[PDB]
């Protein structure tokens, strides 16, 4: 598992790899905010 120290940082890491996907989605948000898309 994680080192005992950084044990407390388990749930956050569970969400870490899902972040790039969000970036993709964010693009669309940005566009919709501008006036395109």
């Amino acid at each position: 598992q994680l080192p005992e120290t950084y044990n407390i940082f388990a749930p956050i890491i569970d969400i870490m790899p899902v972040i790039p996907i969000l970036f993709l989605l964010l693009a669309f948000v940005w566009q919709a905010a501008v006036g395109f898309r």
């Binding site: 969400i15 899902v18 964010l26 940005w30």
Partner: peptide, 27 residues
């Protein structure tokens, strides 16, 4: 009780995106 922590962290990241966009949308 780990699930709540996971969903809170998730909520914070997910919200992090749109918040930056909104903030810059005001300026």
């Amino acid at each position: 009780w780990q699930v709540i922590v996971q969903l809170v962290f998730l909520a914070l990241i997910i919200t992090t995106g749109p918040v930056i966009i909104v903030y810059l949308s005001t300026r």
